[PDB]
């Protein structure tokens, strides 16, 4: 069950953003959204794909364990913040593409396909090249599917060891406060064009007191200056709901 909450639309129109926010208290039993149609529309995951990629890297032994360091070979990478040795949390937080590309290459097509099927991850379409299907290939996932996937992770119900799920959950912590912990991951496909915009994402969950809230936000984006809206719109909505 997905229900439309029209009052959240204020945060989108105030910014002239085409987008969707999906929020589920306690479980995916019932979610609320500003837009029923867009809630189940599928988009390129971009770096939100780091979450399944890291789980699969762990499960297959490509990532040795929680303390694995991804060493920089000294060669140019697309962002300076990637040009350094990284832990799994570090590679996740800076969204270090070449680290996840090398994980994906060693996982290989057969195992990658198998795990995306086990995780019911979007259209499970990995065509477009092993080290770029989530960046520019055919893989698509909706905000609803993201929250379903995050809930499984939270409950250790994905087809992976409990240890590996716990490892990725810790690597995903982005805000710690006395009353709550936020686990989250951003994504940004690029700007495309005005007529064919990129997509930006922010997905995760908030463990607040004894409750949990799963969330997934996405928006069309054609200008990088608008990127902070992927956190501020959902954060404003979660603020007015009393969650954070």
Query: In 3D, which of 107, 114, 235, 91 has the Cα closest to residue 177?
Result: 235
Name the one range near a second copy by CB under 8 A: 4-12, 17-25, 61-69, 137-145: 61-69
B/e letters for 140-169, b = 16+ CB within 10 Å, e = fewer, are bbbbbbbbbbbbbbbeeebebeeebbebbb
SS (H, E, C) 147-159: HHHHHHHHCCCCC
| Strand pairing report for 211-221 and 180-188 | unpaired
d(CA 96, CA 172): 14
Confirm whether residue 119 is marked as ligand binding: no
Looking at the Cβ atoms of 179 and 194, the one nearer to a second copy is 179
Name the one range near a second copy by CB under 8 A: 49-57, 101-109, 171-179, 189-197: 171-179
Give the Å distances, CA to CA, from 211 to 16, 48, 165, 187, 207.
32, 24, 20, 26, 6
117 is a contact residue toward a second copy (CB under 8 A):
no
Task: Confirm if 240 and 210 have CB atoms less than 8 A apart.
Answer: no
175 is a contact residue toward a second copy (CB under 8 A):
yes
> What minimum distance in Å lies between the beta carbon of 152 and a second copy?
14
Confirm whether residue 186 is marked as ligand binding: yes
Structure tokens at 68: 């694995």
Angle at the Cα of 228 (from 26 to 142), degrees rounded to 5?
Answer: 45
d(CA 213, CA 13): 24
Q: Which of 41, 77, 89, 140 binds a second copy (CB under 8 A)?
A: 89
73 is a contact residue toward a second copy (CB under 8 A):
no
> What minimum distance in Å lies between the beta carbon of 79 and a second copy?
13
Name the one range near a second copy by CB under 8 A: 42-50, 116-124, 194-202, 207-215: 207-215
Confirm whether residue 60 is marked as ligand binding: no
Cβ count near 223 (within 10 Å): 10
3 state SS of 214: strand
Active-site residue, 161 included: no
Looking at the Cβ atoms of 38 and 169, the one nearer to a second copy is 169
79 is a contact residue toward a second copy (CB under 8 A):
no
Q: Which of 96, 104, 141, 181 binds a second copy (CB under 8 A)?
A: 181
d(CA 216, CA 233): 11
176 is a contact residue toward a second copy (CB under 8 A):
yes
109 is a contact residue toward a second copy (CB under 8 A):
no
Binding residues: 95, 186, 188, 230
Residues catalogued as catalytic? 47
Binding residues for a beta-lactam: 95, 186, 188, 230
What residue ranges bind a second copy (CB under 8 A)?
66-67, 69, 84-87, 89-90, 93-94, 155, 162-163, 166-167, 169-170, 173-176, 178-179, 181-182, 207, 209-210
């Amino acid at each position: 069950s997905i229900t439309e909450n029209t009052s959240w639309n204020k945060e989108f129109s105030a910014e002239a953003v085409n987008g969707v926010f999906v929020l589920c208290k306690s479980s995916s039993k019932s979610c609320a959204t500003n837009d029923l149609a867009r809630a189940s529309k599928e988009y390129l995951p971009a770096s939100t794909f780091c979450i399944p990629n890291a789980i699969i890297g762990l499960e297959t032994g490509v990532i040795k364990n929680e303390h694995q360091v991804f060493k920089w070979d000294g060669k140019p990478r697309a962002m300076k913040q990637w040009e350094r040795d990284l832990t799994l949390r570090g590679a996740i937080q800076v969204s270090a593409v070449p680290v996840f590309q090398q994980i994906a290459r060693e996982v290989g097509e057969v195992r990658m396909q198998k795990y995306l099927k086990k995780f019911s991850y979007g259209n499970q379409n990995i065509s477009g090249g092993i080290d770029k299907f989530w960046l520019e290939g055919q893989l698509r996932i909706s905000a609803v599917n993201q929250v379903e996937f995050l809930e499984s992770l939270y409950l250790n119900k994905l087809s992976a060891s409990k240890e590996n799920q716990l490892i990725v959950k810790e690597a995903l912590v982005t805000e710690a406060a006395p009353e709550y912990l936020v686990h989250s991951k951003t994504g940004f496909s690029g700007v495309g064009t005005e007529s064919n915009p990129g997509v930006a994402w922010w997905v995760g969950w908030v463990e607040k007191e004894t409750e949990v809230y799963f969330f997934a936000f996405n928006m069309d984006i054609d200008n990088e200056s608008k990127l902070p809206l992927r956190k501020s719109i959902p954060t404003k909505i979660m603020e007015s709901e009393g969650i954070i």
